[PDB]
Amino acid sequence: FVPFEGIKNDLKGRLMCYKQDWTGGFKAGFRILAPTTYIFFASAIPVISFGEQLERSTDGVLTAVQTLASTAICGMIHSIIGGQPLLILGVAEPTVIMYTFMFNFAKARPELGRDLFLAWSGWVCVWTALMLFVLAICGACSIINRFTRVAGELFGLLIAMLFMQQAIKGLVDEFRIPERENQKLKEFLPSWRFANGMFALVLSFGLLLTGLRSRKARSWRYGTGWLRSLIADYGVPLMVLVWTGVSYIPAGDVPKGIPRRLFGNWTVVKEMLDVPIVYIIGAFIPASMIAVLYYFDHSVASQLAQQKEFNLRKPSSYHYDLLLLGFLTLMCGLLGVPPSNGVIPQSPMHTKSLATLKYQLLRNRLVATARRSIKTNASLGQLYDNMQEAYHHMQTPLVYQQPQGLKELKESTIQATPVDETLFDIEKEIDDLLPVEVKEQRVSNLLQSTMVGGCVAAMPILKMIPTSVLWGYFAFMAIESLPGNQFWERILLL
Amino acid sequence: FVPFEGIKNDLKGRLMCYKQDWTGGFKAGFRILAPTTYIFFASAIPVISFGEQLERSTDGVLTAVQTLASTAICGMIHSIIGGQPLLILGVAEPTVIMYTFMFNFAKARPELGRDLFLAWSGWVCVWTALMLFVLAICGACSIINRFTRVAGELFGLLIAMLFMQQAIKGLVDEFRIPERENQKLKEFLPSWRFANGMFALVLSFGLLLTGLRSRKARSWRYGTGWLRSLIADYGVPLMVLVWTGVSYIPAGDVPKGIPRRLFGNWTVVKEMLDVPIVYIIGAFIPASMIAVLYYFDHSVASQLAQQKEFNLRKPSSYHYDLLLLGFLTLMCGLLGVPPSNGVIPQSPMHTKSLATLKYQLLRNRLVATARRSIKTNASLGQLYDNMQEAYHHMQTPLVYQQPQGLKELKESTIQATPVDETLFDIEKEIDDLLPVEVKEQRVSNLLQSTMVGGCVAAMPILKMIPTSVLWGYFAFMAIESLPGNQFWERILLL
């Protein structure tokens, strides 16, 4: 717990893999788009829903534009000067709840009111940034190492429950009347309300089930490997588009608002000084709560994305990441947008997507080299050396760790068996000698954040997405937040 | 093709396993209820739907009561004096189509009209019975042996397509207005029609998916074996009841007819003679068509239930079955109910259910005897002999064939391994040395037919079932009609 020690160590560790990170990201060509698109959707949809929630709860002060902008800019800044690019930054539900409480508080104060809510929020963000700077400098993140696996598994289960609760609330609300829209409308009649609710159920459950099924496309006996990979990679986005189109089928015999549809930044410094100095000091309380919440969430999200099973070859940057989070919180507060922070399951999903990308690249290369070696000599022991050489050749030269390497050939495999092609199927065997590795780089995070920012200008296209699709995705991510963790497995076995 | 040869041979073969059939059925206690209940539902639901269709298409002359009664009585008669009890008898879609055509024809004839439609149908049935008697006596069923596997696979695919088409038509009609009900009603408004359609979609798809998932309960890692078996056995009926109850949840905020709900015999001999003799002769044409259709359907259904992969130990009764079908057609025509005939996939489903029952009984006995032997000596070769002895002891003593017997212990199994319990798991190994056998008896068919007959008196309970559940079951049976047949597999691989 020495001042500036952890930050300096993290910077030293991460400064010798920066060019390597960018060059590795550029090494893979357009194949990096699949994880990028997957995480882009996973980050945009919850953020858009949170923006709509804030707009309904803040009388239009904060909308999806502000949340999307915060997520975007903070994501780009982290991707460029972050330290742990595997982390995905975005506006989380606890931030929305806290901002709702602050807005409700300020609305009842004649001193603050509604026109000064953003300024008071900015002062709260300044206090939170100071607290985060103090925590990072003093090495308070060292306690994160103390927290064991269950400390993160419980948080993941809690986030899954929160996402499922949000989805269920949305589905139920599809049956009810909004508190802002015109009450005397054709689309809001009890019969049409029931129809909207059941249609929302159909769309949401269809999206959820089809996406879950498509996630297992690679393990299908039918179609070609190209199509199977395309489905396994872009199924959930494709399902989103497909069910959005399905929602338009009965448009010729139904009122306008059936099913219900969805729908830069500025500075608040000038009006920040107009706040009387009895609430600038009072911001220490909500700032304290938000600082504690962010200290916990950022670190837990970063560590859940750096699981030992992934065999990462680069160090961690907890302290420097917290310092940059303080800086980003200050910037967001000054810009009049809610702060962003490390979110789950977005970060572990990003890590798993990168691991799958590297796995597929390695599988393709090894299958190619095995096929090339089968024709020439194919000695079953000289071919294996060729695949090992190719594996080492693909690898990025670093200084911290070394490649895991192809694992030992199983005794049963050699016993079953130059090499006879009839008795040696490459596709069946390669999967048995492929380690778990992650393609670590900064390109995927940068593109994902830029795409989220681009959604600000694509609002007309986003107007065509029904809310039922959002609730189906929320449940999909909730199930993704318990993808087989040890705690969930033990509860299941109990 | 000698007169009365095939009938006599079939009777000779089947007359020496009658008491054995009944005693084998009574050997299994209440465990025979699961296949009985499964096939009872599979036979009752399509028959009820066909009855509603006929009622709508025959101006109330024929309802679900007549179809249920025909199915019941014919099923009991076949189960007692049939010859091939694996066959399931019921009113099929081709019979409904033919009867619809005959009713439409008669409605336009002033000589016949509507009050004499049943009498003309009875004369048609008399002609069909005579044709079936002639076909059976002359040994025309010998050509059935000529027809190969594809001849039955194509028929199964056609029946699957017909069932799926019926389900899709029902789902679409849930969105439209019936042509008999009052047009000026609250439940038939366009908004309420749309709500009913989407609710029907939800219920049907929920039933279909939940039943398909529950069909694989035995291969689950969770719960106890008792619960897993109960689910795998009674899932589809339980799902029917569960979704029927779910349909009642919104009853407190929806009109009466949302979702749409579903709702002995006599003699027509006296009015049969009132038909002028220009149509009694004219019945030869529809009688000829129905006779050809029945000759094909009965034989194909019987042979699809006697696949070689099932290793049946009893002979076939094609000719005698056709003769009894002629008798039953005559009886049904005289009773004023549509004739019954062998139906698919009900018969193959019955055979598979009986095979699963025997498999589970054998697995339980072998697991018990292996556990008992493990404590005493457990020599891995003396225990196997004990399991073989138990298998032979359970077996029914017949004269035609012999038990297949436990297959050879795999070389890998013995190589992997008194016997160490840690390295020899019974549950994992038993499945590897269990042959495919069918529990052939007449009790299951008799109980299923009696239950179908009992549904006549349980009409009030059947009034609570929505039509969407029927369409979900129709799709479930359609998928059951292509359960992995070779033709469907080849088309899939193409």
Residue numbers in the entry:
A (entry chain A), B (entry chain B): 5 to 267, 278 to 431, 440 to 516
Sentences reproduced from the published study:
Boron, essential for plant growth, necessitates precise regulation due to its potential toxicity. This regulation is achieved by borate transporters (BORs), which are homologous to the SLC4 family. The Arabidopsis thaliana Bor1 (AtBor1) transporter from clade I undergoes slow regulation through degradation and translational suppression, but its potential for fast regulation via direct activity modulation was unclear.
The protein yields of these mutant AtBor1s were more than 10 times lower than wild type, but we obtained a stable protein sample from an AtBor1 active mutant (R637E/E641R/R643E) using LMNG detergent. The densities for TM13 and TM14 are disordered, so the atomic model was built to residue 516 from a dimer structure at 2.77 Å resolution and a protomer structure at 2.55 Å resolution with robust side chain densities (right). The putative substrate binding site cannot be accessed from either the cytosolic or the extracellular sites, defining this class as an occluded conformation. However, a structure in an occluded conformation has not previously been reported for this family. Interestingly, residues 369–373 and 457–460, which form short β-sheets (β1 and β2) between TM10 and TM11 in our IF and IAI structures, switch their fold to an α-helix and loop, respectively, in the occluded conformation. In addition, TM10 extends to residue 390, compared to residue 368 in the IAI structures.
